[PDB]
Design a protein around this ligand. Sequence first.
Ligand SMILES: [Mg+2]
Ligand SMILES: [Mg+2]
Ligand SMILES: [Mg+2]
Ligand SMILES: [Mg+2]
Ligand SMILES: [Mg+2]
Ligand SMILES: [Mg+2]
Ligand SMILES: [Mg+2]
Ligand SMILES: [Mg+2]
Ligand SMILES: [Mg+2]
Ligand SMILES: [Mg+2]
Lengths: 90, 80, 80
Amino acid sequence: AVKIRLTRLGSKRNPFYRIVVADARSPRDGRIIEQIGTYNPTSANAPEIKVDEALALKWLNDGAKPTDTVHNILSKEGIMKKFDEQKKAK
Amino acid sequence: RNDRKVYVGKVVSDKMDKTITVLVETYKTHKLYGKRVKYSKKYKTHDENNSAKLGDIVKIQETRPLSATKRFRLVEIVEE
Amino acid sequence: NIKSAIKRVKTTEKAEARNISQKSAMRTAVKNAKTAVSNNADNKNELVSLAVKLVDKAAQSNLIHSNKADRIKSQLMTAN
RNA sequence: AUGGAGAGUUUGAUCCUGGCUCAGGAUGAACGCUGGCGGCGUGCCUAAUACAUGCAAGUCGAGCGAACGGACGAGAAGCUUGCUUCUCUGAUGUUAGCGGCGGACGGGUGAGUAACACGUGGAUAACCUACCUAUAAGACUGGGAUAACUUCGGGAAACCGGAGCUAAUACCGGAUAAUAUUUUGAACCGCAUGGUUCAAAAGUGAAAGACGGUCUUGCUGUCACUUAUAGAUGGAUCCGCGCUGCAUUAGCUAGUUGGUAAGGUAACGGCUUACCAAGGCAACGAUGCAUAGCCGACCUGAGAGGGUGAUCGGCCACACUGGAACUGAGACACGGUCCAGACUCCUACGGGAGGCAGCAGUAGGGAAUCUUCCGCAAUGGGCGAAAGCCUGACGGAGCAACGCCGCGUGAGUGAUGAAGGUCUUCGGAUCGUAAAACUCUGUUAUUAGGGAAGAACAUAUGUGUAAGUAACUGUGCACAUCUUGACGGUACCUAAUCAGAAAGCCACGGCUAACUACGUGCCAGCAGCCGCGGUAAUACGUAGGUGGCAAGCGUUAUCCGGAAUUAUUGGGCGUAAAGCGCGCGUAGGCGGUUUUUUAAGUCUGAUGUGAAAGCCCACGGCUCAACCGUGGAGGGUCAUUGGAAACUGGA
Ligand SMILES: [Mg+2]
Ligand SMILES: [Mg+2]
Ligand SMILES: [Mg+2]
Ligand SMILES: [Mg+2]
Ligand SMILES: [Mg+2]
Ligand SMILES: [Mg+2]
Ligand SMILES: [Mg+2]
Ligand SMILES: [Mg+2]
Ligand SMILES: [Mg+2]
Ligand SMILES: [Mg+2]
């Protein structure tokens, strides 16, 4: 189905990722529905994470499902709690 | 509601049944020279009552495919 | 070649056999009902209901699409 | 204002016209010579030729029967109490088969396609959509089979047939349940057809369990199941406009154009079929022929333009050739099926087997294009409750100066201008501060130690919290803990030793930077053009010297430039190439003055959109750069909507 996942960029031995909403059948570095953020694993010994809460929450509401690393990111940024809180509150 | 495209042209054929052919004239600027050149397209239109006649200005709106070649209907007759 | 493919061939055949039998039964019913309606037979309603039932069940099995089922049900039920 | 160079060659000389040629940039390049390293890329363009071999699609025991394995541990003493059997229990496990899901993705290729294929902008009151999310309502009651298995039989084989037996979240009946179907009431609404909403009947349509918790003559958690309605996603159709050469291709079409009715499709529709009519298309290029995947982009150019469509991303098409359907949410299906054909292979001659335009690799073709590698550690995908399994996707490694970028092959001092080579006016001049010598350095190299990031996790294990419950287990969420790296002991770092191992290529008459000697003598040869060479060649060949570049330098091929030589920007037609021999005129192009009006062109805004990557600009990260990342800016002949009205158009 619809998935929030990391698309690989950068160069050899220098990964950079864009956090994107994509259909699963889509190729990893191919067609996407929307980009929500970025993730840099190799940056300054601290993962650098940019995410749009408004976009991430809209997609999580509509049934988009994170890959495991993306879930960790949305947890680190606090989006996964917000999703739960609203959903329980609903 | 989203709006379907509407065109105005002169009826150039009324021979077919419940159908009129409308010639819509537009200008195409030459890519290099920049002069506008007159261009015409004949649009096959549905005229249920066979109301329109050759030489009358008509208003046509886009529709679902009504035939092999017919994609438009007659909204009104502007001039006769 | 591939193991799952070799299995898929068998399951297709079994599926095809069940599907063709059910499709035939529905096709007979619709035919029988249509004749009954046209002939104004006393069994018109009973036969039409059998047709609708078999058609409805066929749609759920995905032997036919719902839209076809609706078309067939409608044409029979308009007739009766 | 950021951006624009010319030169040679028609003559005795000249000005002009005019072609030809060159200096530049670019490449998936190839070839010749030569060759140190690193980073980041790129690498069958030709035969959509044929393909040996391995691998590229599985997974699920928490759907199911069955089989294997049989722990823990049951009995007798062979007097062997360490070895024994079936008279048992039989745990963690494992698998062939059934069933579910996946296999329609990912990966490859560009043959076909001149088309709504694609690009851009719209439409669907003519559509469809597994998994995912949300909400609501349910999951009741029965049945008959069949793999595996057992046995028999037929085949060379591939693989079939009979009998018997057996499960399921397999299959089937009935019940109950629709906004679905029919019919009848309304109400409101749009853009023809029509949309929407609310009532009353009629016919008709579902489902399923598994693994756990508990207070266990009944509740319940998770997952699975069914129906209805939305969302999300993906797909389908239609249309405006844009998108290719040839008229020494001018006519084309009969399901053809329209209508009617019916059938058919998710769906509109000649989509199809009867019937009726004679339409439809075409000089605004139909039809035919040739060629071609299209685009984002890419190369060039001051620009306008011109050329192109590798790598990467999007869309399309194809899967030995041709046809067809089946299964399915989705295929008319690369590693599925059926048939026909060609080819290859096996055979007991009866009959069978197969499809690298997946990754490697081989043969062939070619000027020419890589290893039959490692790992699922990362990212992504399938299956599963999950661990996990599968994954030639992908991450890495290998090979190749193929490209781009970076750094080397030493540095300082050095007249004593050594020797030697070359030239010479025999004075000398030049190679040349070059060398040697002396001192210094270690990029690199070598050797020896240390040694990243990339890793997030998932799971499991605690604690808390939220919803729900009688409660619990679970579930969501939050915070802790252990554990996981192919590359790889790689990058990088440190120390020790050593100028030691690390420069070639083309050119030097002019364009065009750089000349002499000798040999040769219209020969041998050179050559992009002007040309050069027939005895004192800065043009041949070699040598010395010099010039231009540098791990490259040259050559060839091809594209843009210069070429204002198709000229919109930006040329011409008395004598240079070029005014039809001349009328009458059709289409088309163009058109006097004023006022009023309109607003199609024009101008000025707003809104949506013109993917990402790229180009450009800025900033940040890699020791720098290349490269990587991020944010802007730009890119329409775009659509929609609001103004202005001089000019063009309309009235
Ligand atoms: Mg082709
Ligand atoms: Mg120019
Ligand atoms: Mg397949
Ligand atoms: Mg294959
Ligand atoms: Mg270099
Ligand atoms: Mg030479
Ligand atoms: Mg030009
Ligand atoms: Mg002349
Ligand atoms: Mg004259
Ligand atoms: Mg862009």
